[PDB]
Structure 1
Amino acid sequence: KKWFSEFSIMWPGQAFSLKIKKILYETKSKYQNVLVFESTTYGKVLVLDGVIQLTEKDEFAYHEMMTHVPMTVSKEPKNVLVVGGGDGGIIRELCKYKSVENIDICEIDETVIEVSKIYFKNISCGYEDKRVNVFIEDASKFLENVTNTYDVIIVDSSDPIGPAETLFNQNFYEKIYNALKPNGYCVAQCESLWIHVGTIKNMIGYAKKLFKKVEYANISIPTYPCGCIGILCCSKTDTGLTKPNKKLESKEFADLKYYNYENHSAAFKLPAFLLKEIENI
């Protein structure tokens, strides 16, 4: 069998590889190269522009922490926006909340959505839900135009190289600011503390220019570079996102595989070198 290997200039001098059972689908969409394969040990794998975006084995770590962090802090969230997140993992976790009334998803590339509906039926099952509304558009354009404001905005983008390039700037964070309710929350995918401290420092400067509370958490996920991924957490109220305001005790949440009440706060407890870097910001 052959191996898929994940090289990038965004993590120079290192690579992570998975063994391929069979290749399932490959294409050049309007925005990116799309690859789906079955791996021998991580289940099916979505690769976009050569970078692992998700695998069946560990996807729940990122989707649960990205969703249930902000959704346990927001008191009664009604209107939620997902930016990117074509695969549907976030949406799946959002549908567990009976209080949610609407879920807008703004994803630039419909190939991602359709591929996910076909090959990742346990991830993309949230699309069945009547509350979900799909907009195929650059979130950068979408956030300049939206009329609604949102209780939570979850930014589940790919890397700064490619289509997500328009989301890694000051102007984008202003649009997130204006699209949020007076007391709303944003969580954004924010790279790895092991290799991307320059970027984390930028993203935090952008956010702090606008939000009352910017906080950074970290998720263990083995198929992302360095085995972890940060979440940039932005708050309009002074309280922030480190403390859950509810426990997830209904039958909808009995199946949670990573998130719990205790590791919500823990994820915000960062290595010493990172804290040293991010407090003259």
Structure 2
Amino acid sequence: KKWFSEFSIMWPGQAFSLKIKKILYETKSKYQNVLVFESTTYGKVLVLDGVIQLTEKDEFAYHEMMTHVPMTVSKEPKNVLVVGGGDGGIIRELCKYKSVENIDICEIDETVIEVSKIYFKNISCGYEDKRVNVFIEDASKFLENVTNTYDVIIVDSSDPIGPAETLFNQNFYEKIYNALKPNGYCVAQCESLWIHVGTIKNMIGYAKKLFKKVEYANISIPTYPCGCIGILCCSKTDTGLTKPNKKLESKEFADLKYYNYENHSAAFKLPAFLLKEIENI
């Protein structure tokens, strides 16, 4: 049996590898290389341009935290946007909220969605929900053109190398600010505290220009580089995203595997070296 190994200039000198049970699908789309394999121990794995995007084993950790953090803080969110997230994990978690009336997803690469609908049916099940509307477009353009404003924007991008290059900058955060309701929240995938501290500082810097409350949370997920990933949390009001305003008690949330009321605030309690770095920003 062969092994898949994740190398990158974005994390030099380290690599994570998974043993391949069988390759399921491979293609070069208009935007990126796409690879799906069944691993021996992490279940099915999606790889985009050589970078692990999700595995069946741990995906719930990232999708639950990215979704339930802003969604438990927002009082009665009705319109939510997902940027990226073609796999549909975020959308799957959003559909659990009965108050939600509309979910827009803006994904540049329709191949990602189609591959997820075929190979990852427990991740892409949300696409069946009548509230979901799909836009195949660069989020950069979608955000300049959208007429609606959103209660919550979730930025579930890949890394700065590739199609997500348009999403890591100051103009992007302006567009997010403008696409949000007066009391709206954005959460965005932000890199690992263990390797990307200069980037975290940059992103916080861009966000603080516009948002009156910028916070950073960390998630444990073994198949992302360094075994964790951050959430850049941006608020328009003074109160921020560290404290949920509700508990997820109904039957739709019985099955949650990572998120809970106490984990929410705990994820914002960062290692001392990081707080030190992001103080004079």
- What SS does structure 2 have at the residue aligned with 1:24? strand
Q: Please report how far the alpha carbon of residue 210 of structure 1 lies from its aligned counterpart in structure 2 after TM superposition.
A: 0.2
Provide the C-alpha distance between the structure 2 equivalents of 1:238 and 1:5, rounded to a whole number of angstroms: 43
Provide the C-alpha distance between the structure 2 equivalents of 1:20 and 1:178, rounded to a whole number of angstroms: 44
Q: Deviations over 1:16-47 (max 9, x none)?
A: 00000000000000000000000000000000
Provide the C-alpha distance between the structure 2 equivalents of 1:130 and 1:263, rounded to a whole number of angstroms: 31
Q: Please report how far the alpha carbon of residue 221 of structure 1 lies from its aligned counterpart in structure 2 after TM superposition.
A: 0.1
Q: Please report how far the alpha carbon of residue 224 of structure 1 lies from its aligned counterpart in structure 2 after TM superposition.
A: 0.1
Provide the C-alpha distance between the structure 2 equivalents of 1:11 and 1:152, rounded to a whole number of angstroms: 30
Provide the C-alpha distance between the structure 2 equivalents of 1:119 and 1:95, rounded to a whole number of angstroms: 20
Provide the C-alpha distance between the structure 1 equivalents of 2:93 and 2:263, rounded to a whole number of angstroms: 17
Q: Deviations over 1:81-118 (max 9, x none)?
A: 00000000000000000000000000000000000000
Q: Please report how far the alpha carbon of residue 280 of structure 1 lies from its aligned counterpart in structure 2 after TM superposition.
A: 0.3
Provide the C-alpha distance between the structure 1 equivalents of 2:7 and 2:261, rounded to a whole number of angstroms: 36
Q: Deviations over 1:155-192 (max 9, x none)?
A: 00000000000000000000000000000000000010
Q: Please report how far the alpha carbon of residue 136 of structure 1 lies from its aligned counterpart in structure 2 after TM superposition.
A: 0.1
- What SS does structure 2 have at the residue aligned with 1:46? strand
Aligned residues: 281
Percent identity between matched residues is: 100
Task: Name the structure 1 match of 2:49.
Answer: 49
Task: Name the structure 2 match of 1:139.
Answer: 139
Q: Deviations over 1:181-216 (max 9, x none)?
A: 000000000010000001000000000000010000
Q: Deviations over 1:115-143 (max 9, x none)?
A: 00000000000000000000000000000
Q: Deviations over 1:32-72 (max 9, x none)?
A: 00000000000000000000000000000000000000000
Provide the C-alpha distance between the structure 2 equivalents of 1:141 and 1:202, rounded to a whole number of angstroms: 22
Q: Please report how far the alpha carbon of residue 235 of structure 1 lies from its aligned counterpart in structure 2 after TM superposition.
A: 0.0
- What SS does structure 2 have at the residue aligned with 1:143? helix
Task: Give the TM-score, by structure 2 length.
Answer: 1.00
Q: Please report how far the alpha carbon of residue 237 of structure 1 lies from its aligned counterpart in structure 2 after TM superposition.
A: 0.3
Provide the C-alpha distance between the structure 2 equivalents of 1:162 and 1:35, rounded to a whole number of angstroms: 15
Provide the C-alpha distance between the structure 2 equivalents of 1:205 and 1:233, rounded to a whole number of angstroms: 12
| CA RMSD after TM alignment | 0.2
Provide the C-alpha distance between the structure 2 equivalents of 1:238 and 1:93, rounded to a whole number of angstroms: 26
- What SS does structure 2 have at the residue aligned with 1:246? coil
Provide the C-alpha distance between the structure 2 equivalents of 1:16 and 1:191, rounded to a whole number of angstroms: 16
- What SS does structure 2 have at the residue aligned with 1:153? strand
Provide the C-alpha distance between the structure 2 equivalents of 1:212 and 1:183, rounded to a whole number of angstroms: 11
- What SS does structure 1 have at the residue aligned with 2:275? helix
Q: Deviations over 1:226-281 (max 9, x none)?
A: 00000000000000000000000000000000000000000000000000000100
Provide the C-alpha distance between the structure 2 equivalents of 1:269 and 1:98, rounded to a whole number of angstroms: 30
- What SS does structure 1 have at the residue aligned with 2:231? strand
- What SS does structure 1 have at the residue aligned with 2:191? coil
Segments of structure 2 that go 5 or more residues without pairing to the other structure are none
Q: Please report how far the alpha carbon of residue 15 of structure 1 lies from its aligned counterpart in structure 2 after TM superposition.
A: 0.0
Task: Give the TM-score, by structure 1 length.
Answer: 1.00
Task: Name the structure 1 match of 2:120.
Answer: 120
Structure 1 runs (4+) deviating above 3 angstroms are: none
